[PDB]
Amino acid sequence: DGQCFLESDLFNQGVRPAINVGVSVSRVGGAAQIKAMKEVAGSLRLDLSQYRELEAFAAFASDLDAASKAQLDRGARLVELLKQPQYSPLAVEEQVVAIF
Amino acid sequence: DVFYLHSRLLERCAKLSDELGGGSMTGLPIIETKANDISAFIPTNVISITDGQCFLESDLFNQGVRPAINVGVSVSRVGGAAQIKAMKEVAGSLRLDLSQYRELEAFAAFASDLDAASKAQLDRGARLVELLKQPQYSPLAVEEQVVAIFLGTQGHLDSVPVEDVQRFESELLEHVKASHSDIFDGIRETKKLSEEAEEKLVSVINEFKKGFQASDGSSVVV
Amino acid sequence: PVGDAFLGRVVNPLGQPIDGQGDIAAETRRALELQAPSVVQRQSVSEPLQTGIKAIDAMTPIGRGQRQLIIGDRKTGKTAVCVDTILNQREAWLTGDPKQQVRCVYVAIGQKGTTIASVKRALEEGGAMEYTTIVAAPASDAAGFKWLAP
Amino acid sequence: LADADAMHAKALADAKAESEKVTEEAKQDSERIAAQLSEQAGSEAERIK
Amino acid sequence: PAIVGDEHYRVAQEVIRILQRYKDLQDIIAILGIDELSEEDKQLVNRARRIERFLSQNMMAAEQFTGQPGSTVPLKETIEAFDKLTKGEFDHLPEQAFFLIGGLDDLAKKAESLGAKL
Amino acid sequence: PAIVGDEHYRVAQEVIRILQRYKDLQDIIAILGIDELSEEDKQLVNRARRIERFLSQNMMAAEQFTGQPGSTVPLKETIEAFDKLTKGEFDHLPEQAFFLIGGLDDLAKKAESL
Amino acid sequence: FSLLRDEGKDPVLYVVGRKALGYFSFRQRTVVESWTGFSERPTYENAREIA
Amino acid sequence: ATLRELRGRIRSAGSIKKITKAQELIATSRIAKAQARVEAARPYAAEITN
Amino acid sequence: EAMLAKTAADNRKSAEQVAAAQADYEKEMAEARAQASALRDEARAAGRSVVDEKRAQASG
Numbered sequence: 066d067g068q069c070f071l072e073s074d075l076f077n078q079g080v081r082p083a084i085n086v087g088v089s090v091s092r093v094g095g096a097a098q099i100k101a102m103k104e105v106a107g108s109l110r111l112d113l114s115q116y117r118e119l120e121a122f123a124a125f126a127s128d129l130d131a132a133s134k135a136q137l138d139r140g141a142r143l144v145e146l147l148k149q150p151q152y153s154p155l156a157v158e159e160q161v162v163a164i165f
Numbered sequence: 166d167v168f169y170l171h172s173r174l175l176e177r178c179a180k181l182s183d184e185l186g187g188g189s190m191t192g193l194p195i196i197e198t199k200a201n202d203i204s205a206f207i208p209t210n211v212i213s214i215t216d217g218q219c220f221l222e223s224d225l226f227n228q229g230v231r232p233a234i235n236v237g238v239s240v241s242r243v244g245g246a247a248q249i250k251a252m253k254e255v256a257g258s259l260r261l262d263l264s265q266y267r268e269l270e271a272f273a274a275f276a277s278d279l280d281a282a283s284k285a286q287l288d289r290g291a292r293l294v295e296l297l298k299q300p301q302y303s304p305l306a307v308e309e310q311v312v313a314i315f316l317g318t319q320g321h322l323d324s325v326p327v328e329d330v331q332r333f334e335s336e337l338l339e340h341v342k343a344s345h346s347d348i349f350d351g352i353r354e355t356k357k358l359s360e361e362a363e364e365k366l367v368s369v370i371n372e373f374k375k376g377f378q379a380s381d382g383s384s385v386v387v
Numbered sequence: 388p389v390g391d392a393f394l395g396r397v398v399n400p401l402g403q404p405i406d407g408q409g410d411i412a413a414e415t416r417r418a419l420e421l422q423a424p425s426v427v428q429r430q431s432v433s434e435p436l437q438t439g440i441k442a443i444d445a446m447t448p449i450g451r452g453q454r455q456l457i458i459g460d461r462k463t464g465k466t467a468v469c470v471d472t473i474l475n476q477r478e479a480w481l482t483g484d485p486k487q488q489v490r491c492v493y494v495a496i497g498q499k500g501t502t503i504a505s506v507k508r509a510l511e512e513g514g515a516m517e518y519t520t521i522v523a524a525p526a527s528d529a530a531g532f533k534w535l536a537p
Numbered sequence: 538l539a540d541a542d543a544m545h546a547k548a549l550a551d552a553k554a555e556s557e558k559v560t561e562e563a564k565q566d567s568e569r570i571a572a573q574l575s576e577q578a579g580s581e582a583e584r585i586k
Numbered sequence: 587p588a589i590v591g592d593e594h595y596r597v598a599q600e601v602i603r604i605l606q607r608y609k610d611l612q613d614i615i616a617i618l619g620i621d622e623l624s625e626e627d628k629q630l631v632n633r634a635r636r637i638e639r640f641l642s643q644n645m646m647a648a649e650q651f652t653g654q655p656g657s658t659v660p661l662k663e664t665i666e667a668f669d670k671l672t673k674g675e676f677d678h679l680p681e682q683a684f685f686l687i688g689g690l691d692d693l694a695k696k697a698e699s700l701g702a703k704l
Numbered sequence: 705p706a707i708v709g710d711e712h713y714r715v716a717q718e719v720i721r722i723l724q725r726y727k728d729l730q731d732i733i734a735i736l737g738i739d740e741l742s743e744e745d746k747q748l749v750n751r752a753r754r755i756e757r758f759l760s761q762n763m764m765a766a767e768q769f770t771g772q773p774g775s776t777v778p779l780k781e782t783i784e785a786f787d788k789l790t791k792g793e794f795d796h797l798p799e800q801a802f803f804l805i806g807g808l809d810d811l812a813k814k815a816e817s818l
Numbered sequence: 819f820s821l822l823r824d825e826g827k828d829p830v831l832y833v834v835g836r837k838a839l840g841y842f843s844f845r846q847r848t849v850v851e852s853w854t855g856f857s858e859r860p861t862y863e864n865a866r867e868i869a
Numbered sequence: 870a871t872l873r874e875l876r877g878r879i880r881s882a883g884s885i886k887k888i889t890k891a892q893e894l895i896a897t898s899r900i901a902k903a904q905a906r907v908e909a910a911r912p913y914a915a916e917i918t919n
Numbered sequence: 920e921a922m923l924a925k926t927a928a929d930n931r932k933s934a935e936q937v938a939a940a941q942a943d944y945e946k947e948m949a950e951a952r953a954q955a956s957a958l959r960d961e962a963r964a965a966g967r968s969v970v971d972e973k974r975a976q977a978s979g
């Protein structure tokens with residue numbers, strides 16, 4: 066019912082857990098989340114997929130429109146937020162606040 | 166014996182000698198490639214067996230080139246022996262022109278930098294590629310094909326915008342068929358384009374150009 | 388069975404009609420594995436076979452007695468080219484001269500029945516059924532029929 | 538100035554005449570196309586019947 | 587054209603052509619960047635990105651995965667919207683405005699929410 | 705050189721080098737135009753054109769198409785002729801003079817014909 | 819810059835073109851003025867303004 | 870799927886090669902133009918120097 | 920002085936009228952050609968409608 070794809074390239078970049086957001090999916094979706102988490106993380110996966118697409122696309126763009134730059138900034142911050150060390154669990158409420 | 170299967174099937178398509186009545190059977194086998202892998206076993210066998218290949222490609226089809234035949238790699242070993250004299254004359258320069266156009270396509274946006282010859286070749290190739298496009302379920306008679314290729318290869322489409330070429334051709338072919346069918350009749354009966362027929366066709370083309378309208382409101386005369 | 392009565396009919400690899408139009412009067416019978424014309428029983432291919440497609444007729448012309456492969460990925464327009472050739476043969480048919488008339492045989496191997504029906508409708512719309520025979524071995528037919536249809 | 542005005546008027550009249558001729562040709566071509574397409578439709582009606 | 591009509595067929599073919607050209611140019615954009623493309627190719631790339639985003643849609647069955655209610659677009663509206671897109675009439679809107687929406691009204695509302703006017 | 709001789713190898717290598725440089729300059733000729741090239745480039749283009757047209761020959765099998773018969777150039781004659789050509793000793797002659805001929809005698813005969 | 823600093827001076831920086839602008843932006847060196855958009859084909863007016 | 874990605878990379882490299890070759894030829898022409906402009910500018914520099 | 924000014928103005932007017940003759944000629948001919956093309960296109964469309972309607976009637 067879905068898979069968490071882990072990549073060594075992402076792992077070496079500091080993305081821990083090295084979950085490939087684009088091709089990782091849960092087939093249950095919001096039904097497996099509490100209401101608060103579903104509210105604060107409704108479109109996080111799609112947002113990060115679009116962010117990775119834009120980051121690849123705008124790798125060598127000399128000048129970027131304001132919207133694209135804002136999207137890149139938001140995606141970079143979200144990627145940093147999702148990073149988590151091993152043996153450092155977060156309670157569901159703490160995760161909700163962080164994603165908020 | 167799969168190669169034997171196909172080869173024994175396809176060698177029955179033959180042009181019989183006059184002693185046997187002169188009959189003939191022409192084979193048009195179809196092969197479906199996967200991911201355009203003409204190196205697969207059965208495509209390789211059938212390619213080795215046949216006298217020529219028409220390679221159709223998905224990228225060409227999506228580009229609007231329909232029929233999506235890749236003229237660069239498509240071949241016919243019989244060649245001009247299977248053409249009438251008029252088609253041989255008009256279609257002589259098509260291959261080299263299209264090859265040069267494919268070479269020059271990289272410089273589409275640098276036409277100003279290109280010398281006169283290169284820009285002329287680019288424009289001619291674009292017009293010829295537009296000319297070879299054809300709608301489905303609409304085959305053309307040999308005389309109409311000769312006249313269209315004559316338009317393409319004699320520079321009569323040089324003044325026509327690329328986006329209009331197709332339409333132009335069609336309308337022109339209509340106009341002749343309604344007022345100067347003697348050109349088509351001459352081509353069909355003699356299988357060659359006579360000098361008088363050629364000059365009459367040129368005059369008809371010029372008058373029609375006087376009458377034709379580009380989609381962008383420009384003029385196609387001269 | 389073989390004969391002029393097969394023009395305009397859809398038959399299975401055994402020659403049995405499957406179009407529901409009744410029996411086919413067979414002129415004679417031909418074994419499927421008769422040898423091809425020998426090397427000294429032929430002559431050079433010289434008569435054009437006009438497909439009506441400018442690209443083919445100008446770049447890769449096809450002569451009568453030639454074997455021209457139509458090769459490409461799916462949905463690239465191969466059946467369209469072949470059907471266009473068959474339709475183009477209609478003026479030659481109407482000429483009435485056997486030296487110009489071209490009789491068409493469309494062999495469908497592994498296609499779904501509705502696709503064969505669509506091809507037949509396309510041929511009828513252009514009046515090509517008058518001089519065209521269809522040998523059909525749809526996907527539901529046994530592997531032997533698909534093997535023997537050509 | 539007088540000769541230029543006279544030549545301009547002559548050109549205007551010639552333009553009138555040539556426009557009339559070309560629109561006449563357009564009328565003939567339009568009627569011919571209508572008749573030919575009607576004939577084609579009738580022939581296809583015969584084929585359908 | 588015979589079944590769906592000339593307009594639908596033409597719009598679909600134009601969309602396919604633009605997307606095919608964009609697919610061809612993707613590698614060049616990745617390596618050398620968009621700034622090395624011809625002006626017409628830059629225009630086509632922007633149009634293609636907007637078109638590919640607009641082909642996406644919020645589905646009724648997808649809510650469980652996104653929380654966004656689905657939408658339905660009539661065929662006439664789809665044809666008109668993609669005709670407008672293929673002509674560059676929405677080139678001034680950000681591409682994000684075209685992502686996971688319905689018709690042109692949804693496009694206008696999302697563009698307004700993103701700081702642009704349709 | 706151990707097989708065909710040193711002179712043969714030297715002449716062949718010179719011909720190959722000239723033809724390769726001409727092939728390299730072909731793209732510039734085609735797009736930027738011939739005049740865009742330097743003077744040495746033009747000299748080498750002329751010499752390479754003459755060399756490449758001289759590699760053509762009137763074949764025996766071609767006699768069935770054109771009435772002219774075929775030619776057989778002895779190896780020494782070919783070596784010396786192409787050595788002279790690479791040195792630019794025939795660069796002034798017209799290009800057509802190097803089409804479908806045999807050795808140097810045929811070259812001179814066709815040169816006088818033009 | 820190293821030579822000038824060894825000569826007891828301070829460099830006041832002006833830039834023509836965008837690549838140098840990006841380089842010095844990364845280095846955080848201040849650029850008093852920058853002119854861009856004519857490096858490929860400069861006219862006398864640009865040189866006059868710079869001078 | 871190694872072969873598929875290899876073919877995709879071959880296509881990408883071919884496109885990059887075509888673009889780079891075109892840019893190289895355009896740069897040759899632009900060098901010609903720039904040298905012509907330098908030559909055109911020379912005489913005024915000489916006269917003003919004198 | 921008025922005669923000199925009028926001579927200059929009349930030379931300019933003669934030049935501009937010799938130009939405007941051709942300009943109006945081209946404009947009117949473009950209009951007539953556009954009318955002809957529109958007539959031909961609408962005739963073709965009407966014939967297409969005729970054939971399609973006859974197809975539907977024959978099918979019925």
Ligand SMILES: Nc1ncnc2c1ncn2[C@@H]1O[C@H](COP(=O)(O)OP(=O)(O)OP(=O)(O)O)[C@@H](O)[C@H]1O
Pocket residue numbers: 231232299300301460461462463464465466467468
């Ligand atoms: N010349 C053409 N112009 C426009 N559309 C065409 C043309 N030829 C074919 N098509 C369309 O392309 C699509 C594929 O055509 P076709 O079925 O003949 O291809 P194919 O390669 O035989 O397909 P398949 O894999 O289904 O056997 C169909 O929609 C057909 O209408």
Ligand SMILES: [Mg+2]
Pocket residue numbers: 465466467
């Ligand atoms: Mg098919």
